[PDB]
């Protein structure tokens, strides 16, 4: 038995002693503050466990306990949504009419005149409108009662207390040894089967036994208070057979492999449910079954205590070719002896997954009546875009940290990491050329369109009435997807999503999903997206590759991961660290995500969202102006920003006035960022000296000497303020626009 | 009166703003059933609006052509309910805060670990100075006359110039 | 030592990198470092990558003095080699000896060195820049 | 001045100009700046002491 | 509104005067750099040592006050 | 650009571009006389400030002219 | 009428910044401390900390109060 | 080339010589301090100006001073 549980007993005593000794974790900060830099260094080095201890075992134990604390915070955050739905919401009135009642689960206290924020959301309720989509998520689970929300909140509180106790227990009572964490094959098998496949299996079971009958009865017109309770549906084959006439046969067709008898509640019809404008829940349960079987099957791959299985060291070391030398040899030790490498991979995967979630949940609305809730769709898309962008920047940050700290040349000789590091100039040069080519083309077409329209030459533009740039490949892929049911998806009733072409889906006048037509403006903005992604990749990859050394500075690894410069020498070595590369790439991530969400908002308001009247008359929100106005920068400025800021600037005196307040405040914070971003430390230090003179004159000098913020801290403060102001301005603008139309 | 302004109790635009403010909430009130806490909250808002406008009329504020109260920071005695009396109140409170901070600074300087007394506050002594700073205009004057408030000037560090 | 370099010293086995000297090393200025090893082991190159240092005597060409001194710092703070020599090769095959000049390291005192750039007063007693106006000289 | 004296620094380019410090050691030799003064406030590099000449200290308190 | 915007204008004038006067008076030296006159009116920095010396010259004070002048004129 | 990003990033980028031009066929016969380097720190501050000011003037003048011209009052 | 006013105000801001810039240059490389011993100009450098600190107080007071009034009205 | 000067407030604690990445500084004998040595800059043409020596000086307002001046192919740190 090689895979075993080895655990130390009572390693660290639980005491409130180092709570009163701040900065105890590091050697330098524990000696007490002399200046007002020890405070910021205390805050910056709190989670840098690799610089506190040289033992990987203690670092891993700290990571595990911190994971438990994070999971406790997330459980409390789930419990807040369930409790606010139970006690502070209009979820019942929304259930009785989920097309005219606006969801709201957040009520303000009247003290200062802020009771105007309690708007008329419908159903005899006053509160702030909710764009989280938790109401549709609860309706997709069959939570028609307000008691089940309360008990879900109580269970979430219990689970959060459990995670707090587990975090204390695994650091102070039973902390696992280093050999426990390095069982990556066992961890991989257990995650792939028990977490993913068993979660899919249990959720498919809940779906089949609770959400399918309750949502079927809800779509049939039965009021929520006359629907059988989920425990009355769980153990009633007669009632389920009344709803789905396949439970008469019971579990026997499952074991006899006659799975075709279960096609009443396990379908592959595709498309959207016409009643709710969402995916069929039978398709969802079938999807979760397929995923559960696939994940449990995949969790049987890696070797554990028994002789069957794979070793991941042998898989990696067998993959090598002529052009790559030793191949993947030595990556197993890298990924089993370093946490920063695992962050660099997992953050990239999680950011890309969040972006995939954003692209998939708008064209395929998975919750009932979420497609006709336009604020929910816009908020979810923009949210997951921003989360994905932040995580994909953090992946490059931790790759740089690994390259500075945990890299070893003796371990990684002539493998893929060494070969990548030995030709980094070619990579950075060619990616530089690609960035310049994409930028010149994609942006100069916009500038050329601006010039032609300003010179009174619309016939010389890059438009559909002019020189055309038709995205022929995307149109071909759309035509392939539209013809998939029957030909390349023979057991399919409808298309995967209606964005690829097909039929307009309408739920009580509003458009749920209709085909999205691609023109030359779509070609132009997709090339803009590719260019912005490429420049962000250029900055982050240059930071990762040149983290150890460069032609300018041969010993950059000896200076650390983050450091301000190496003096004014060599003409100037400002922002040479990989940290400054992450700092510069975060701005370009912000630019890319802002352009992506602007494209989404304008295209969906212009060509998808709207109303339908008699004889299929489609009237969109903005009037189909994306095709001719998204070709010029002036068209963007006038028809998107100026035209859609009318809702956020006229929100004063109404229930949306908080959005205007946050609009102004986020503009203020964004402008406040440039103070740190443009200026430098020495001026502020001299001004602080001038203030310290007056303080010394009035016997007011603090013993902790006041200092200006450090150069790295000044850059970090400016970047954080810039991101907060930008995301706040876009947040308030989107929410105030899309709530009011 | 001053600057051509009229009293808010004698201004028609102020009363028009009153009527508009109560009519907006009355129009918001019509979609709620009576006895519900939303209805009670809205009528409480209406009563609060009426009380606020009546108070602004009664306090003697001057409204302009827009029907909004205009504060006279001149220093006239009949407008001392404006700036001057909150000026005295804030000056007293700000001097209180400054003197409490200065007294705790002196105490923390006179100890053995001045740095640790500023990130970790000696709460009993801090409360002592904090409550004893209520007579700051007298204590500060006594320290100024005694020569303990100000450093001579040749003892504070200065840049070379 | 003197201004002599053995051109036939074996080089560390390196797979070739995109960090080496460019065209202005056979045109303007080139640097080399020679050291003595006791065993065959792997060291990190200052121009990225990893190279195996040969057991015995080694020779390595770089483009600037900073790279040679960074490699010497690596050969000191890590596995102990303290007899490295840094040269400067001109395009006309002329070599000039730079590091360990007087034979000993600069941090250790050596009798026979002359102080260059020493100033006989504190830094706060420099002349004002008005007194050097229209003269070409400076207050250093 | 002696060891343990409290002195005021008269060097204009020093961080502790017109500030009080404590004499630590007076070296008896050819040193140009023999007196060692230790201060309670660190400078920008964080260094507490410095070497000073006998004419750069104004003296405040005898040992 | 004229009162409020006149106070804003006074704010802009005083802050631009602050930056310019501080640069002019600390052009000859400060605690962070007592020998600033030896390095001239315009120089990049004094290195990352003793905390960091970004934007320490009087030329950088001009460069900082240019933004504030543009702000108050706007 | 010039106000927020500082020399080091651009100097390394210039060095990669120098390798690119020196190590490509056909185009390496064209040789520069002055070695390309990044802009100096004070030069970068000046260039970014001049950009800020020129953009400031050239975005306020059309507004203050066209808004008055577009209303005649 | 609009263009001439904006013209001359921006030019006024430019000249105002340049005057202080050249005063800083004069302090850097034209000011003689021995010629100006106890002068009306050297005393400006003697109490420069008071001047910068009081400009700091005026600017902070004005900014705090006019931004607070504007945000209150908002 | 930059110009490096060492003033008589040197204590001979050798940190500037160790911090130098371009072999500019070296220790010469002296009699003005307890250590009997003062720093010197005999190879200021190899100075790059990174001011690592000025970060390593412990004396109040550093004794070794680097003034940025003319730029050459060595002081710019150009490999091309
Ligand atoms: C099938 C077994 C199993 C399961 C379910 C998990 C599940 C988990 N592990 Mg884990 N692990 C396992 C085996 C397993 N592990 C083994 C064998 C090893 C050693 C090789 C590890 C080593 C390991 C490390 C080192 C870490 C984890 C972490 C995690 C969490 C990942 C965060 C997440 O996705 O949140 C999803 C959240 C939930 C699913 C909430 C439920 C939480 C409980 C604890 C899950 C199990 C409940 C219970 C068994 C099911 C009862 C069913 C009942 C209702 C009928 C997750 C709770 C990470 C973590 O977050 O640490 C805390 C982490 O750092 N694991
Ligand atoms: C973790 C998920 C989960 C859970 C807890 C259950 C639980 C249950 N299922 Mg079930 N089921 C599931 C997933 C799940 N199912 C899936 C994924 C499918 C699709 C293939 C089905 C299809 C299904 C049918 C068709 C029927 C049940 C039935 C039942 C009930 C009695 C079965 C039993 O214990 O017999 C004893 C257990 C064994 C013999 C083994 C029980 C409540 C029956 C029911 O409705 O009961 C009232 C029934 O007729 N299930
Ligand atoms: C899985 C997520 C994850 C994890 C575990 C870590 C973990 C770590 N990161 Mg990391 N990082 C991440 C994501 C993550 N990061 C992402 C997504 C980015 C891109 C933005 C980065 C960018 C990054 C950099 C650039 C650096 C790190 C560093 C570190 C290390 C020390 C962090 C520390 O002490 O901060 C302590 C925690 C804080 C100081 C709190 C920060 C508070 C933020 C800035 C403000 C948040 C504002 C809030 C959202 C909204 C406020 C609203 C307002 C109205 C109040 C640690 C190993 C540092 C290091 O040295 O690594 C070795 C380092 O230099 N990370
Ligand atoms: C609107 C402001 C703006 C603009 C135009 C740019 C432009 C650029 N940045 Mg950038 N940047 C900005 C703000 C801006 N930045 C800010 C605020 C920051 C701070 C975070 C940065 C940080 C930053 C970094 C860190 C990097 C860039 C890079 C780039 C370049 C991308 C390559 C490219 O496509 O160039 C092509 C030129 C354009 C896209 C702009 C002009 C397009 C015109 C309209 C068409 C062509 C005109 C032609 C050349 C001249 C004809 C007219 C002439 C004859 C008169 C490009 C020069 C990257 C780079 O240089 O690597 C390649 C890079 O790594 N920037
Ligand atoms: C109680 C402590 C205290 C006192 C008496 C003063 C007194 C003074 N400060 Mg000051 N200051 C303080 C703390 C204090 N400061 C702190 C903590 C900071 C950092 C944020 C500053 C930052 C600061 C600047 C930047 C400036 C002054 C200036 C001034 C002078 C003019 C008044 C003014 O502008 O106030 C304004 C005061 C502030 C904006 C800071 C207030 C912050 C809090 C509210 C005060 C601290 C209270 C403290 C926590 C109480 C704890 C003690 C308790 C345990 C008993 C005056 C001598 C100005 C000057 O030089 O004019 C000649 C000037 O430009 N101060
Ligand atoms: C009568 C007015 C006047 C005079 C005689 C001078 C004279 C002088 N100044 Mg000066 N200055 C002035 C006004 C004046 N200035 C004003 C108003 C300001 C504030 C903005 C300054 C700010 C200033 C600084 C900060 C500095 C000087 C310096 C100098 C000296 C050298 C000049 C030099 O090298 O420039 C040579 C010429 C140039 C550099 C040309 C640059 C072109 C500028 C950046 C504009 C380019 C933008 C362009 C128009 C964009 C086109 C837009 C289009 C595409 C649409 C010289 C004695 C310098 C000096 O030596 O001091 C020690 C110095 O450091 N001055
Ligand atoms: C909108 C952007 C913005 C804002 C708000 C500021 C704000 C400020 N800058 Mg500044 N700056 C900016 C952009 C900005 N800058 C840019 C882009 C540059 C170019 C690099 C500069 C360059 C610059 C220089 C060079 C200098 C300043 C200075 C100042 C200060 C002036 C004093 C003042 O107004 O105090 C008012 C304080 C504020 C407006 C900050 C907000 C504080 C709170 C949030 C206000 C809340 C209102 C109310 C009081 C709340 C009650 C508090 C509650 C706890 C009771 C102030 C902190 C000067 C300085 O520091 O002198 C003292 C100075 O020398 N800045
Ligand atoms: C909402 C929420 C919650 C809740 C949750 C829940 C409610 C859960 C549940 C869960 C569950 C309830 C789960 C279950 C599961 C189950 C399973 C997972 C089963 C499995 C089974 C199997 C796997 C079988 C097998 C077999 C076969 C088939 C053959 C052989 C034999 C046997 C029988 C063994 C809480 C409060 C926490 C918090 C908040 C949120
Ligand atoms: C009759 C009249 C009156 C009066 C008036 C007056 C008296 C005015 C004045 C005014 C004034 C009285 C103004 C002033 C201003 C000032 C200024 C504006 C200044 C500036 C300065 C500067 C800019 C500086 C510079 C420099 C430097 C920095 C350094 C040194 C050198 C020099 C000098 C160059 C009244 C009201 C009763 C009313 C009626 C009419
Ligand atoms: C009649 C009136 C007015 C006017 C006013 C004025 C004009 C004032 C002035 C004022 C002034 C012209 C003042 C000055 C001052 C000076 C000084 C020099 C002060 C000082 C102070 C201090 C020094 C303080 C200290 C302290 C204390 C005692 C407490 C707290 C803490 C401390 C330490 C800070 C008006 C029209 C507005 C309105 C009506 C009324
Ligand atoms: C202003 C500034 C400083 C000075 C900033 C300092 C000293 C920060 C001071 C932190 C304060 C004390 C934290 C608390 C702030 C206020 C006391 C509270 C305001 C609360 C509001 C929400 C009202 C730098 O040190 C700096 C360094 C490098 C680049 C740019 C800059 C820079 O722009
Ligand atoms: S950050 Fe400041 S000190 Fe560092 S190189 Fe840049 S200008 Fe010089
Ligand atoms: S670091 Fe400074 S004090 Fe020490 S020997 Fe070198 S020059 Fe002298
Ligand atoms: S500037 Fe750099 S290279 Fe020159 S002496 Fe100082 S540390 Fe050495």
Q: For residue B70, give every residue at least 6 positions away whose Cβ sits within 8 Å of its Cβ, in sequence order, or none.
A: B3, B5, B61, B62, B63, B64
C-alpha span between A685 and E54 (Å, rounded): 10
Nearest residue to H66 (alpha-carbon basis) of A330, A240, A568: A568
Q: How far is CA A537 from CA A385, A432, A589, A720, D16, in A?
A: 16, 10, 9, 20, 49
> D52 to chain C: which residues are within 8 Å by CB?
none
Six token digits for residue D46: 């964080």
Q: Which burial class, exposed, middle or buried, applies to B5 when counting CB atoms under 10 A from its CB (0-12, 13-18, 19+)? A: middle
Which stretches of D4-60 are assigned E, i.e. beta strand? 6-8, 20-26, 35-38, 49-52
Nearest residue to A385 (alpha-carbon basis) of A203, A532, A500: A532
Place of tokens 């320490």: E56
- In eight-state DSSP terms, residue G33 is T
| DSSP symbols for E9-70 | HHHHHHHHHHHHHHHHHTTT--SS-TTTTTS-S--S-S-S-TT--TT-SHHHHHHHHHHHHH
Nearest residue to A549 (alpha-carbon basis) of A585, A572, A584, A576: A576
Give the phi and the psi of residue D6 in degrees, each rounded to 5. Answer: -100, 120
CA-A438 nearest atom, ligand 4: 34
Q: How far is CA A173 from CA A14, A56, A170, G13, in A?
A: 9, 18, 6, 68
C-alpha span between B9 and B6 (Å, rounded): 8
Six token digits for residue A437: 């080519």
Q: How far is the CA of C53 from the centre of ligand 7 (A)?
A: 57
CA-G27 nearest atom, ligand 9: 29
Q: Which helix (H) or strand (E) holds A474?
A: helix A472-482
Neighbours of H11 (CB within 10 A): 21
| DSSP symbols for A124-166 | S-EE-B--S-HHHHHHTTT--SHHHHHHHHHHHHHHHHHHHHH
Is ligand 4 within 6 A of the CB of residue A540? no
Cβ pair B10, B62 in contact under 8 A: no
**Cβ E21–G51 below 8 Å, yes or no?**
yes
Measure CA A664 to chain center.
26
Q: Residues of A annotated as binding site for [4Fe-4S] cluster?
A: 565, 574
Q: Which burial class, exposed, middle or buried, applies to A484 when counting CB atoms under 10 A from its CB (0-12, 13-18, 19+)? A: middle
Six token digits for residue A316: 């990696």
Neighbours of A300 (CB within 10 A): 13
Six token digits for residue A641: 């920003």
Cβ pair B8, B14 in contact under 8 A: yes
Torsion of CA C32, C38, C42, C47, to 10 degrees: -10
Cα within 13 Å of Cα(A59), Cβ side: 15
Q: What angle do CA A540, F8, H18 make, to 5 degrees?
A: 115
SS3 H27: strand
Give counts: helices (H), strands (E), chain A. 30, 8
Experimental method: cryo-EM
Expressed in Å, this structure's resolution amounts to 2.8
Which residues, in sequence order, are bridge partners of residue A211?
A: none
CA distance, residue G12 to nearest chain F CA (Å): 14
Give the phi and the psi of residue D8 in degrees, each rounded to 5. Answer: -110, 130
Pocket probe mutation, ligand 6, options G15, G22, G27, G29, max atoms within 8 Å of Cβ: G22
Q: For residue A138, give every residue at least 6 positions away whose Cβ sits within 8 Å of its Cβ, in sequence order, or none.
A: A85, A91, A149
Q: How far is CA A289 from CA A280, B15, G59, in A?
A: 15, 68, 67
C-alpha span between H14 and H32 (Å, rounded): 15
Nearest residue to C52 (alpha-carbon basis) of C37, C72, C34, C67: C37
Nearest residue to C44 (alpha-carbon basis) of A410, A523, D1, A419: A410
Is ligand 11 within 6 A of the CB of residue A708? yes
SS3 H67: strand
Q: Which residue on chain A is closest to H74 by alpha carbon?
A: A570
Q: Are strands A119-120 and A126-127 parallel, antiparallel or unpaired?
A: antiparallel
Q: Which residue on chain D is closest to B153 by alpha carbon?
A: D18
Six token digits for residue A672: 């406040």
* Long-range contacts, B117-121 (Cβ 8 Å, 24+): B117/A703, B118/A702, B118/A703, B118/A704, B119/A22, B119/A33, B119/A39, B119/A704, B120/A20
Nearest residue to A684 (alpha-carbon basis) of A712, A716, A706: A706
Nearest residue to A141 (alpha-carbon basis) of A9, A1, A34, A288: A288
> D41 to chain E: which residues are within 8 Å by CB?
none
End-to-end CA distance of chain F: 39
Q: How far is the CA of A108 from the centre of ligand 11 (A)?
A: 32
C-alpha span between A342 and A63 (Å, rounded): 12
With DSSP H G I counted as helix, E B as strand and the rest as coil, what are the percentages for chain H, rounded to 5?
15, 20, 60
- In eight-state DSSP terms, residue A191 is I
Is ligand 13 within 6 A of the CB of residue H27? no
Task: Write down which chains contact chain B via at least 3 CB pairs under 8 A.
Answer: A, D, E, G
Q: How far is the CA of H22 from the centre of ligand 14 (A)?
A: 7
SS3 A322: coil
Helix axes E2-25, E58-73, angle to 10 degrees: 170
Six token digits for residue A596: 């992506």
Q: Which helix (H) or strand (E) holds F8?
A: helix F7-22
Cβ pair A542, F13 in contact under 8 A: yes
Using a CB–CB cutoff of 8 Å, tell me whether E28 touches chain B: yes
Q: Which residue on chain D is closest to E49 by alpha carbon?
A: D45
Nearest residue to H23 (alpha-carbon basis) of H50, H44, H2: H44
Is ligand 12 within 6 A of the CB of residue A552? no
| Rounded CA Rg of chain A | 29
The string over A573-609, giving b where at least 16 C-beta atoms fall within 10 Å of a residue's C-beta and e elsewhere, is bbbbbbbbbbbbbbbbbbebbbbbbbbbbbbbbbbbb
Q: Which helix (H) or strand (E) holds B125?
A: helix B123-132
Cβ pair A81, A132 in contact under 8 A: yes
Nearest residue to H52 (alpha-carbon basis) of E49, A236, B37: E49
């Amino acid at each position: 038995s090689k895979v075993r549980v080895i655990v130390d007993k009572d390693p660290v005593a639980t005491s409130f002693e180092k709570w009163a000794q701040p900065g105890h974790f590091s050697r330098t900060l524990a000696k007490g503050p002399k200046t007002t830099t020890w405070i910021w260094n205390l805050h910056a080095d709190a989670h840098d466990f690799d610089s506190q201890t040289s033992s990987l075992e203690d670092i891993s134990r700290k990571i595990f306990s911190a994971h438990f604390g994070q999971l406790a915070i997330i459980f409390l955050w789930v419990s807040q949504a369930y409790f606010h739905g139970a006690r502070f919401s209009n979820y019942s009135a929304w259930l009785l009419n989920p097309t005219s009642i606006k969801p709201s689960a957040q009520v303000v206290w009247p003290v200062v005149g802020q009771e105007i924020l309690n708007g008329d959301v419908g159903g005899g309720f006053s509160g702030v409108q909710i764009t989280s989509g938790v109401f549709q998520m609860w309706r997709a689970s069959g939570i028609t009662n307000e008691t089940e929300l309360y008990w879900t909140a109580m269970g979430g509180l219990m689970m959060s207390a459990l995670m707090v106790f587990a975090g204390w227990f695994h650091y102070h009572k039973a902390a696992p040894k280093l050999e426990w964490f390095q069982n990556v094959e066992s961890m991989m098998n257990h995650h792939l089967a028990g977490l993913l496949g068993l979660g899919c299996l249990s959720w498919s079971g809940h779906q089949i036994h609770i959400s399918l009958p309750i949502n079927k009865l809800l779509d049939a017109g039965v009021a929520p208070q006359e629907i059988p309770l989920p425990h009355e549906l769980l153990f009633n084959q007669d009632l389920m057979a009344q709803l789905y006439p396949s439970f008469k046969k019971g579990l026997l067709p499952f074991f006899t492999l006659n799975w075709g008898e279960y096609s009443d509640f396990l379908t592959f019809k595709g498309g959207l449910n016409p009643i709710t404008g969402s995916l069929w829940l039978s398709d969802t349960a079938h999807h979760h079954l397929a995923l559960a079987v696939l994940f449990i099957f995949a969790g049987h791959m890696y070797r554990t205590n028994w002789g069957i299985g794979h070793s991941m060291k042998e898989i990696l070391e067998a993959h090598k070719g002529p052009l790559t030398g030793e191949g993947h040899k030595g990556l197993y030790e890298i990924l089993t002896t370093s946490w920063h490498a695992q962050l660099a991979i997992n953050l990239a995967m999680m950011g890309s997954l969040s972006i995939i979630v954003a692209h998939h949940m708008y064209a395929m609305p998975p919750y009932p009546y979420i497609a006709v809730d336009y604020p929910t769709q816009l908020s979810l898309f923009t949210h997951h875009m921003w989360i994905g962008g932040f995580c994909v920047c953090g992946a490059a940050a931790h790759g740089a940290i690994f390259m500075v700290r945990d890299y070893s040349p003796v371990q990684s000789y002539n493998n893929l990491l060494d070969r990548v590091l030995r030709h980094r100039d070619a990579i950075i040069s060619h990616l530089n050329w690609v960035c310049i080519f994409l930028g010149t083309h994609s942006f100069g077409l916009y500038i050329h369109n601006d010039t032609m329209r300003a010179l009174g030459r619309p016939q010389d533009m890059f438009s559909d009435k002019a020189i055309q740039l038709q995205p022929i490949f995307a149109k071909w892929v759309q035509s392939l997807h539209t013809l998939a049911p029957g030909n390349t998806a023979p057991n399919s009733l409808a298309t995967a999503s209606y964005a690829f072409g097909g039929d307009v889906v309408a739920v009580n006048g509003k458009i749920a999903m209709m085909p999205i037509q691609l023109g030359t403006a779509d070609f132009l903005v997709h090339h803009i997206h590719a260019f912005t992604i490429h420049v962000t990749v250029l900055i982050l990859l240059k930071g990762v590759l040149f983290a150890r050394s460069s032609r300018l500075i041969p010993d950059k690894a000896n200076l650390g991961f983050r450091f301000p410069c190496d003096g004014p020498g060599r003409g100037g070595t400002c922002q040479v660290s990989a940290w400054d590369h992450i700092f510069l790439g975060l701005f370009w991530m912000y630019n890319c995500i802002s352009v992506v969400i602007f494209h989404f908002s304008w295209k969906m308001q212009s060509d998808v969202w709207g109303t339908i009247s008699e004889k299929g008359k489609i009237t969109h929100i903005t009037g189909g102006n994306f095709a001719n106005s998204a070709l010029t920068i002036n068209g963007w400025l006038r028809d998107f920003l100026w035209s859609q800021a009318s809702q956020v600037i006229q929100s004063y005196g109404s229930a949306l006035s908080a959005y205007g307040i946050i609009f102004l405040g986020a503009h203020f914070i964004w402008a406040f960022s440039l103070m740190f971003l443009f200026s430098g430390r020495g001026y502020w230090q001299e001004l602080i000296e001038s203030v310290v003179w007056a303080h010394n004159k009035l016997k007011l000098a603090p013993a902790i000497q006041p200092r200006a913020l450090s150069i790295t801290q000044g850059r970090a403060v400016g970047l954080a303020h810039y991101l907060l102001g930008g995301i706040g301005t876009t947040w308030s603008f989107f929410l105030a626009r899309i709530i009011s139309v | 009166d001053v600057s051509g302004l009229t009293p808010c109790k004698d201004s028609a635009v102020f009363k028009k703003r009153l009527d508009g403010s109560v009519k907006k909430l009355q129009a918001r009130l019509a979609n709620y059933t009576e006895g519900t806490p939303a209805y009670l909250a809205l009528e409480q808002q209406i009563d609060q609006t009426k009380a606020r406008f009546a108070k602004y009329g009664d306090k003697g504020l001057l409204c302009g052509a827009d029907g909004l109260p205009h504060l006279i920071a001149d220093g006239r005695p009949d407008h001392a309910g404006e700036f001057v009396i909150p000026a005295f109140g804030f000056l007293y409170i700000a001097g209180w805060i400054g003197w409490a901070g200065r007294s705790y600074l002196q105490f923390s300087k006179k100890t053995d670990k001045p740095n640790e007394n500023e990130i970790i506050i000696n709460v009993p002594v801090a409360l002592g100075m904090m409550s004893g700073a209520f007579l700051w205009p007298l204590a500060a004057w006594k320290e100024l006359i005694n020569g303990q408030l100000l450093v001579p000037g040749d003892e504070v560090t200065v840049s070379p110039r | 030592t003197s201004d002599v370099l053995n051109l036939q010293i074996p080089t560390p086995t390196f797979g070739g990198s995109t960090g080496g000297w460019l065209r202005a090393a056979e045109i303007e200025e080139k640097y080399a470092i020679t050291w003595t090893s006791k065993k065959e082991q792997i060291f990190e190159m200052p121009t990225s990558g990893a190279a195996i240092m040969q057991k015995g005597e080694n020779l390595l060409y770089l483009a600037k003095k900073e790279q040679c001194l960074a490699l010497s710092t690596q050969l000191r703070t890590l596995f102990k080699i303290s007899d490295y020599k840094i040269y400067r090769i001109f395009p006309n095959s002329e070599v000039q000896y730079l590091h360990p000049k007087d034979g000993v390291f600069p941090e250790k005192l050596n009798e026979g060195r002359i102080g260059v750039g020493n100033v006989g007063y504190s830094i706060g007693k420099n002349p004002n820049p008005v007194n050097v106006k229209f003269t070409g000289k400076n207050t250093f | 001045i002696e060891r343990g004296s409290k002195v005021r620094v008269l060097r204009p380019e020093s961080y502790w100009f017109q500030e009080c410090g404590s004499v630590a050691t007076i070296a008896k030799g050819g040193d140009r700046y023999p007196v060692v003064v230790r201060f309670e406030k660190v400078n920008y590099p964080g260094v507490a002491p410095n070497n000073f000449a006998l004419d750069e200290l104004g003296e405040v308190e005898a040992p | 509104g004229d009162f409020l915007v006149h106070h804003a204008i006074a704010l802009g004038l005083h802050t631009t005067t602050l930056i310019l006067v501080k640069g002019a008076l600390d052009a000859r030296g400060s605690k962070l750099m007592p020998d600033k006159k030896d390095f001239g009116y315009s120089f990049p920095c004094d290195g990352p040592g003793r905390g960091g010396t970004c934007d320490i010259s009087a030329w950088d004070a001009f460069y900082l006050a240019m933004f504030w002048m543009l702000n108050t004129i706007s | 650009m010039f106000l927020i990003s500082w020399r080091g990033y651009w100097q390394e980028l210039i060095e990669t571009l120098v390798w690119a031009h020196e190590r490509t066929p056909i185009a390496n016969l064209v040789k520069w006389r002055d070695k390309p380097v990044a802009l100096s720190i004070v030069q970068a501050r000046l260039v970014g400030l001049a950009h800020f000011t020129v953009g400031f003037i050239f975005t306020f003048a059309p507004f203050v002219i066209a808004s008055t011209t577009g209303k005649f009052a | 009428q609009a263009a001439l006013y904006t013209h001359h105000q921006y030019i006024a801001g430019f000249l105002m910044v340049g005057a202080f810039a050249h005063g800083a240059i004069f302090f850097v490389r034209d000011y003689d401390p021995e010629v100006n011993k106890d002068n009306v100009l050297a005393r400006m450098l003697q109490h420069k900390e008071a001047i910068i600190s009081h400009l700091s107080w005026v600017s902070l007071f004005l900014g705090f109060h006019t931004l607070g009034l504007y945000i209150h009205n908002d | 080339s930059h110009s490096v000067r060492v003033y008589d407030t040197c204590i001979g604690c050798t940190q500037c010589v160790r911090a130098c990445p371009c072999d500019v500084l070296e220790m010469v004998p002296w009699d003005g301090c307890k250590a009997g040595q003062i720093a010197s800059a005999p190879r200021a043409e190899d100075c790059i100006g990174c001011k690592r020596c000025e970060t390593a000086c412990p004396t109040d307002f550093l004794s070794v001073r680097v003034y940025l001046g003319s730029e050459t192919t060595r002081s710019l740190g150009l490999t091309y």
